[PDB]
């Protein structure tokens, strides 16, 4: 399943979580939103872990994958951006 396909799915999930987060900040509805967001963030993180593992595999075996170096770097930046986006929301859910 190509990285670019997964990338689009992860971005959509982060955008959806941000929508929930904006609702949560505005605000039983609060309890439901808290749960939905916590679950949603955990789900995104599982997906990010998988992307990170694939980056590691591809970098370690360039003969097999032949992924251009620029493209590999853009994957790492994408994962870092998404991790940061998730962490911003997670910070506010603590406790």
UniProtKB/Swiss-Prot annotation:
GO terms for biological process: Golgi vesicle transport; intracellular protein transport; regulation of protein localization; retrograde transport, endosome to Golgi; vesicle docking; vesicle fusion. Residues 28-56 form a coiled coil. GO terms for molecular function: SNAP receptor activity; SNARE binding; syntaxin binding. It is found in: Golgi apparatus membrane. Expressed at high levels in heart, skeletal muscle and pancreas. The modification Phosphoserine is found at residue 95. Keywords: Acetylation, Coiled coil, Golgi apparatus, Membrane, Phosphoprotein, Protein transport, Transmembrane, Transmembrane helix, Transport. GO terms for cellular component: cytosol; endomembrane system; Golgi membrane; perinuclear region of cytoplasm; SNARE complex; synaptic vesicle membrane; trans-Golgi network; trans-Golgi network membrane. Its main location: Golgi. SNARE involved in vesicular transport from the late endosomes to the trans-Golgi network. Interacts with VPS52. Belongs to the syntaxin family. This is Syntaxin-10.
């Amino acid at each position: 399943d190509p990285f670019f396909v997964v990338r689009g799915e992860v971005q959509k999930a982060v955008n959806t979580a941000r929508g929930l987060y904006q609702r949560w900040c505005e605000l039983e509805e609060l309890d439901w939103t808290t749960n939905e967001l916590r679950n949603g963030l955990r789900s995104i993180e599982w997906d990010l872990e998988d992307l990170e593992e694939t980056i590691g595999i591809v970098e370690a075996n360039p003969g097999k994958f032949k992924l251009p170096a620029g493209d590999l770097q853009e994957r790492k930046v994408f994962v870092e951006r998404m991790r940061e986006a998730v962490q911003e929301m997670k910070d506010h859910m603590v406790s």
